[PDB]
Design a protein around this ligand. Structure first.
Ligand SMILES: Nc1nc2c(ncn2[C@@H]2O[C@H](COP(=O)(O)OP(=O)(O)O)[C@@H](O)[C@H]2O)c(=O)[nH]1
Length: 194
């Protein structure tokens, strides 16, 4: 809503407070970041001759929607209608102050506003690897509960390892969705004609 181009290819960052969202944005955009107020953050980067933005909205996409007022919801909804892929980051070290299960609960609670592609980012691997079987099966359950096309990416925004890889899989998930969706529109229009 505040000075965002809705047509530019976008990574929409989401996840609990202190999971590494602002860190991720800063790394991939080399801090080429516009600070906009309603604070909303828009990082910019190029990948493979294409221009991208990456958006971080602390206070909006880091907590459940139950407590939002109308204006906040319209802002959230406006973001959900951008040309974007979601990067939902889970801090698997739990240093953010919430357990993996509480972070997955957050994901289910808010993934309904987005049917876009989603990358689940497992961050802070410098402080982890492995996981409880209930946690691994909770993560696996995401693939069953979710109609959205979903990929996984592990990284550390403290050490840099896997970060660029995570950025690459987000972009390509977007491409594939753009490709699949334009076909459905082309098909419906011809099926109408015929
Ligand atoms: N151990 C570790 N700490 C991290 C990593 N990435 C970020 N942090 C720290 O986690 C805290 C929150 O990170 P931040 O980017 O502000 O998360 P955000 O609130 O979601 O935007 C900060 O103290 C960061 O320095 C990581 O990969 N590993």
């Amino acid at each position: 809503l505040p000075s965002i181009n809705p047509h530019k290819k976008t990574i929409i960052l989401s996840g609990a407070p202190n999971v590494g969202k602002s860190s991720f944005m800063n790394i991939v955009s080399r801090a080429n970041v516009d600070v906009q107020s309603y604070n909303l953050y828009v990082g910019h980067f190029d990948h493979k001759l294409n221009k991208y933005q990456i958006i971080d909205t602390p206070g909006l996409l880091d907590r459940a929607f139950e407590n939002r007022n109308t204006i906040e919801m319209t802002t959230i909804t406006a973001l959900a209608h951008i040309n974007g892929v979601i990067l939902f980051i889970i801090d698997i070290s739990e240093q953010c102050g919430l357990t993996i299960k509480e972070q997955i609960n957050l994901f289910y609670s808010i993934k309904s506003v987005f049917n876009k592609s989603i990358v689940i980012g497992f961050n802070k691997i410098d402080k982890c690897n492995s996981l409880s079987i209930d946690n691994k099966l909770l993560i696996k359950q995401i693939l069953d509960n979710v109609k959205n096309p979903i990929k996984f990416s592990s990284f550390s925004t403290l050490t840099g390892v896997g970060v660029e890889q995570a950025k690459i899989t987000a972009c390509e998930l977007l491409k594939n969705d753009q490709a699949e969706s334009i076909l459905l529109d082309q098909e419906q229009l011809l099926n109408t004609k015929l």
